[PDB]
Design a protein around this ligand. Sequence first.
Ligand SMILES: *[C@@H]1O[C@H](CO)[C@@H](O)[C@H](O)[C@H]1NC(C)=O
Length: 201
Amino acid sequence: HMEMSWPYPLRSRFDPQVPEEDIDYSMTSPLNSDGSNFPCKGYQTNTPWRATAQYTAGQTYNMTITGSATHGGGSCQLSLSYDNGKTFKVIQSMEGGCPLVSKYNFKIPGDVANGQALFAWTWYNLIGNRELYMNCADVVISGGTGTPSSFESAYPDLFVANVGNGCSTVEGRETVFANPGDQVIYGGTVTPSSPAFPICH
Ligand SMILES: *[C@@H]1O[C@H](CO)[C@@H](O)[C@H](O)[C@H]1NC(C)=O
C-alpha cells in the first residue's frame, strides 16, 4: 500500500492543482491482475497534461514513495516514456529493499530526449499477492542529446509482470531484472552477483 508522492503523479491526493473530484484517494491499489489498467491506471489518457517536474539532463533529483505498508520490500524501476505510455525505458532499477526507504535519488542521463514525458515508478512487492504497483507523472525534460528513437534503442525496456502477460513474480524470491540498466541500487538480499529472476518468455 504505497504510492509515489514526489513528483506528483496523475490524480495525486498530494498535488494541490488536482480538483477534489479528480483525486484518486485509493491510489495505493495495485494494477488490475488482467492488465486492463496497465500502464499508469490509464490516467495518461484522460487527465490534463500538466508537468509536476522539470528535469535537466545530467542532473540528480529525488522521488518519494509514501504509504501504510511496504510488504517486506521488493524491487522498483524508474522509467521514461516519450509516447504517452506506449513504451517505457528504464533509467534506474532498485533491486531489493524497495521501498524500505521513502526517498530515492536518481540521475537523468545526458542522452535522454527533450520535451514532454511520463515518469513512471513501478514496484513488485516481495511479500503477499503477486502485484504490480505503478504511478506516472507528467514531466518536462531539457538539455538532453538524444531523440525518442536513440533513447528507445540505448535503454532497457521496463520489466512488466503480474498483468496477465504470462510473466509473474514469485513470493519469497527477490525480483532481479534481466535488463536493469547501468544505474542500479542494490538492497534487501540482492547483490551485483544475484541471478536474474524471474525469467519471462
Ligand atoms: C526532492 O523531494 C522533495 C519532496 O520530498 C521535493 O520538494 C524536492 O523538490 C526534490 N528535490 C529534487 C532535487 O528533486
